[PDB]
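Hi team,

Below is the intake form for CylK from Cylindrospermum licheniforme UTEX B 2014. Please confirm the fields before the structure is written into the shared record.

FORM ID: S-0412
PROTEIN: CylK
ORGANISM: Cylindrospermum licheniforme UTEX B 2014
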Amino acid sequence: SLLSADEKITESLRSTLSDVLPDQLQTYIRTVLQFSGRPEGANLLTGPNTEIEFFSQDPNKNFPNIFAKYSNVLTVSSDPNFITSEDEEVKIIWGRHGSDSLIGFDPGADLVGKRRIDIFLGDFIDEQFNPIPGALNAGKSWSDRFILGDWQKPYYFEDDETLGLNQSAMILDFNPNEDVIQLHGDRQDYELVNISLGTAIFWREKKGYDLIGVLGGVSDLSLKGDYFEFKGNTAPKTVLKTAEHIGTAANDYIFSSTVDAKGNFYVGGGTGGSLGGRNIGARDAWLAKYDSNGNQRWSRQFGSTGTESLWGMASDGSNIYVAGNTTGQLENNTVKGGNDAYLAKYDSDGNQVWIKQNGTYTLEESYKITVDSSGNIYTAGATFGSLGGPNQNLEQGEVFELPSTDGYVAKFDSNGNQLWVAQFGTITLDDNWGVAADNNGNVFAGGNTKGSFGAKNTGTAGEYDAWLVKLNKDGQTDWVRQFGTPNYDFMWDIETDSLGDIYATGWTLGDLGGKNAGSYDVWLAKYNTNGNQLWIKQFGTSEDDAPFLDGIDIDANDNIFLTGNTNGNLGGANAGSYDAWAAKFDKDGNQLWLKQFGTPDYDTATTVTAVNFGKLYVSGITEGSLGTTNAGSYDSWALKLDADNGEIQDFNS
Ligand SMILES: CCCC[C@@H](F)CCCC[C@H](C)Cc1cc(O)c([C@@H](CCCC)CCCC[C@H](C)Cc2cc(O)cc(O)c2)c(O)c1
Ligand SMILES: [Ca+2]
Ligand SMILES: [Ca+2]
Ligand SMILES: [Ca+2]
Ligand SMILES: [Ca+2]
Ligand SMILES: [Ca+2]
Ligand SMILES: [Ca+2]
Ligand SMILES: [Ca+2]
Ligand SMILES: [Ca+2]
Ligand SMILES: [Ca+2]
Ligand SMILES: [Ca+2]
Ligand SMILES: [Ca+2]
Ligand SMILES: [Ca+2]
Ligand SMILES: [Cl-]
Ligand SMILES: [Cl-]
Ligand SMILES: [Cl-]
Ligand SMILES: [Cl-]
Ligand SMILES: [Cl-]
Ligand SMILES: [Cl-]
Ligand SMILES: [Cl-]
Ligand SMILES: [Mg+2]
Ligand SMILES: [Mg+2]
Ligand SMILES: [Mg+2]
Ligand SMILES: [Mg+2]
Ligand SMILES: [Mg+2]
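The structure came back. Fields below:
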């Protein structure tokens, strides 16, 4: 019976949210939701007002740590939730700009009996907090997809004698004119109830009801509305049986790839399941080796009871170096506080040689790694602390400036000894999305900034620009460059060619290398070793086109390969939702080919690696059945392409 559902839902959500979320975070959230005009969730947080310790050096009190522990803050891009992990009872999942595919509940995780509330914000963009109107994106919003179930099962589903209040989504900014709520089954499986908070979505069967989600501030919806997408009960039909399929019942992601000197191909990423080994807890890091004929030689899985991923990998020709972040304590290491970065070394036989966990009392992230021809290793990332030197935003002064990251680069020898760490940026946000060594002892880094790092930012409201830094063999800066439009421009990855010139790829909402075709467009920029911008190419469709994650590689012939996602007809007719794409360019930016592939469901490439004089590998993630039947939520895939024309080959030969 749905009698008194309103009262029961409010008391359940209030009790769980107020029991789980720290008082500092409750105080912060209450302030934000009231200021923003999304106040429905506020009365659910009843902890006392508490001083927010934005700059505490105690890892347990440091507010960036607290906020990060209970949130997935996504990017200005159209994001899948690439950071989701079953490590907390309550999570705030914040899509920000772009058309986000928002998930927080892993249907393959053992969550029986666990309290689970995912609080979703599809947009709630940064511009809402602008004291001054007129910013280019003020008042803009995007179609976000809130994933509350799929072909396999409803999410947040306890399937018991209660109303199923212990697990539920709470979507705070659902706009039925733009957004979509994705549900398992069909409309006859649900009942909507108007409640004080908005709308309750109940799964309904003969034996009773189970609360799947609450939509704050919206009432009088219809399950016949096109803003509900029902997924039935049957896994998607398989396409691209030529691909290598990697998947478990849980969320599985390839985030990076590399090749060794013998042509063996490696992939890796994160998994909520038991992919390379038995799951240790929440998301673990994993990697796998394939021979050049496509046979898997081994898979390995590592981490902690907390959350970690492999975000980058590279080879010295034999060994495989891997980099990412962790929320826990890795083997043979000590935590530095909050989230930390790590570098690890695997030999060609899959033996873990060592792991080095590094960081400060506050949050580090690290998505990038490169290995030079001498065998030294560079990682890069961002830090809220003072890792390579004092953070540009050290403490709170008379003018408050929100705690913010600087970029860093760290150099290591083959035994994992740290040779130096460099840190740089502005008082505001500076993130890292690239690292690449040249042949002459230098290393480049790149990323995004809200500030004026290498040049005056032409945005009027702190919109992102791209930046590049050249460091010498000792970690000293030789130059800093910055480029962009007045709108958001976002870098994903960088790489050098055989001459030592530096290339970067990303997306733009403006006219960076030419007239924007619509929405997000792709760019490729080239700088010489002396910091001169040589050219920027921009291309796309009228729809949303972007590289993603490990989006560039350069082969021994100085051909450039890019990869990412598009919801347009970029390389061909779109199969449905976002598809993957890849492209090849020469060193002067002439585009040699452009291909698109995927399933009728959401796909994105995440990594591209070219074998010198061999095959091209494009790998990524999907909600569809790519290679074989989807085993649960996100699965991953690798495609072997002919590098001359982008045509897909059978993975196994
Ligand atoms: C209920 C909804 C809450 C929504 C909102 F309340 C959350 C504020 C959390 C703030 C937290 C204490 C710390 C933090 C800061 C940070 O920058 C980032 C970056 C990631 C870059 C570093 C890896 C992405 C998110 C930027 C969003 C800014 C609003 C943009 C900004 C930055 C800035 O430096 C100055 C500004 O004025 C505005 C975090 O992920 C977490
Ligand atoms: Ca986004
Ligand atoms: Ca969004
Ligand atoms: Ca939206
Ligand atoms: Ca439920
Ligand atoms: Ca783990
Ligand atoms: Ca840390
Ligand atoms: Ca900074
Ligand atoms: Ca810009
Ligand atoms: Ca476009
Ligand atoms: Ca790369
Ligand atoms: Ca697709
Ligand atoms: Ca899966
Ligand atoms: Cl971002
Ligand atoms: Cl706004
Ligand atoms: Cl109940
Ligand atoms: Cl209805
Ligand atoms: Cl099939
Ligand atoms: Cl082997
Ligand atoms: Cl600045
Ligand atoms: Mg029930
Ligand atoms: Mg296979
Ligand atoms: Mg097989
Ligand atoms: Mg201004
Ligand atoms: Mg390479």
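SUMMARY LINE: The two ends are 59 Å apart (CA to CA).

Thanks, M.
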